Amino acid sequence: LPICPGGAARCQVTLRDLFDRAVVLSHYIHNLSSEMFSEFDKRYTHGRGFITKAINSCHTSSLATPEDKEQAQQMNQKDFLSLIVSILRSWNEPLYHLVTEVRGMQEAPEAILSKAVEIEEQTKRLLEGMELIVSQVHPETKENEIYPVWSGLPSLQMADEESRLSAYYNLLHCLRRDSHKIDNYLKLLKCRIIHNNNC
């Protein structure tokens, strides 16, 4: 039978194809959060002396994510698919503010904005790759897209460089580690998604 009868805008998609793109797409955000934050850390917090505190609030940490690889094996449930959606959506808002404040930042107008505008867009792409993957791996899932909330950056007019820096230091830094976590799950899921030998 024809792969795509006539011409459907939706047409059919191979779970492996989108999953493979979603697995690699997660690495792209890693570079964005890594370089986008590093360009900021070395620009506004260049050896500031106060950003050396081990700070990793990570609002998504509250999500029921796997504590370690051993627990992830113990999980083996739809929670993995739900956790990815919660993490990617949780950063959809925080990235919006980073782009708005950076857009008006004379010190960071297009430099950091270039990564901030593309980092918020790729994060949503993983969402679609995941929503079809979760809907294909677990057809029972009707529409699961619950994510944490946001309680940081109460006011973005903080002109203080030391205070405002914390505003993005907490977000951009956790944005990187979390982007890796979202990327890590696609790698583990690959083991039972396309090839038994992987991860």
3-state SS track over 114-130:
HHHHHHHHHHHHHHHHH
Q: Which of 100, 122, 97, 96 is nearest to 109 (CA)?
A: 100
Copy the structure tokens of residue 138: 């677990």
C-alpha–C-alpha distance, residues 88 and 108, integer Å: 24
b/e sequence 25-46, b meaning 16+ C-beta within 10 Å: bbebbbebbbebbebbbeebbe
Look at the domain 1-199 and name its fold: Growth Hormone; Chain: A; (1.20.1250)
Domain ranges, ordered by start, for the chain: 1-199
Method for structure elucidation: NMR
| Chain centroid offset of residue 123 CA | 5
Q: Are 181 and 123 in contact (CB under 8 A)?
A: no
Copy the structure tokens of residue 59: 């609002």
C-alpha–C-alpha distance, residues 71 and 65, integer Å: 9
Q: Is 157 helix (H, G, I), strand (E, B) or coil?
A: coil
Q: Are 112 and 43 in contact (CB under 8 A)?
A: yes
Within 10 Å of residue 188's Cβ, how many Cβ atoms? 17
b/e sequence 140-165, b meaning 16+ C-beta within 10 Å: ebeebeebbeeeebeeeeeeeeeebb
- Residue count of the chain, please give it: 199
C-alpha–C-alpha distance, residues 78 and 138, integer Å: 7
Q: Are 81 and 138 in contact (CB under 8 A)?
A: yes
Q: DSSP state, 109?
A: S
Q: Are 56 and 37 in contact (CB under 8 A)?
A: no
- Rounded to 5°, the CA angle 165-167-171 comes to 110
Element (H, E) at 182: helix 161-193
C-alpha–C-alpha distance, residues 120 and 65, integer Å: 22
| Chain centroid offset of residue 126 CA | 8
Q: Which of 146, 153, 143, 145 is nearest to 175 (CA)?
A: 153
Q: Are 97 and 152 in contact (CB under 8 A)?
A: no
Could you write out the DSSP letters of every residue in 28-61? HHHHHHHHHHHHHHTTTSTT-SSTTS-----GGG
- Residue 37's identity, in one-letter code, is F
Q: Rg (Cα) of the chain, in Å, rounded?
A: 19
